[PDB]
């Protein structure tokens, strides 16, 4: 009993004092956050269009001269989603395991 009550005591003291104890769980929250922050950061890319902003194309070009620019942003943003969903699908398998 005294050895058990002491050991359950050290569990509190260890978790309370150290920074690292939950690192395996913090690393999941961090990877989930990082990938969403990256998927947002990707939206700022031109991919070779005259703007990263969809409205700044549609407010500067006509209904034909825009389509090539917009298709660049579609291709880049769609490949950004296929990357994210591949990362998260593969990651899911790690969490399942």
């Amino acid at each position: 009993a005294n050895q058990f009550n002491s050991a359950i005591g050290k569990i509190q003291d260890s978790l309370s004092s150290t920074a690292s104890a939950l690192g395996k769980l913090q690393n999941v929250v961090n990877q989930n956050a990082q990938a969403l922050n990256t998927l947002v950061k990707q939206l700022s890319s031109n991919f070779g269009a005259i703007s990263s902003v969809l409205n700044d194309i549609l407010s500067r070009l006509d209904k034909v001269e825009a389509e090539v620019q917009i298709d660049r942003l579609i291709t880049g943003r769609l490949q950004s989603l296929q990357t994210y969903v591949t990362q998260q699908l593969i990651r899911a398998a790690e969490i399942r395991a």
């Binding site: 947002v40 950061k41 939206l43 700022s44 902003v53 700044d56 549609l58």
Partner: protein
């Protein structure tokens, strides 16, 4: 406070406009969020934010 199709100076978009507390310095006209999307503007006629 209503959803609207705004244009300021050619910065076309869609949103609810609202009164800001962001301390824009006299030289500034737009303010941006992490995503590189505008989320504040100084109105070109009456210079409130």
């Amino acid at each position: 406070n209503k959803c609207v199709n705004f244009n300021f100076n050619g910065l076309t978009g869609t949103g609810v406009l609202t009164e800001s507390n962001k301390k824009f310095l006299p030289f500034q006209q737009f303010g941006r969020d992490i995503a590189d999307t505008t989320d504040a503007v100084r109105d070109p006629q009456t210079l409130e934010i």
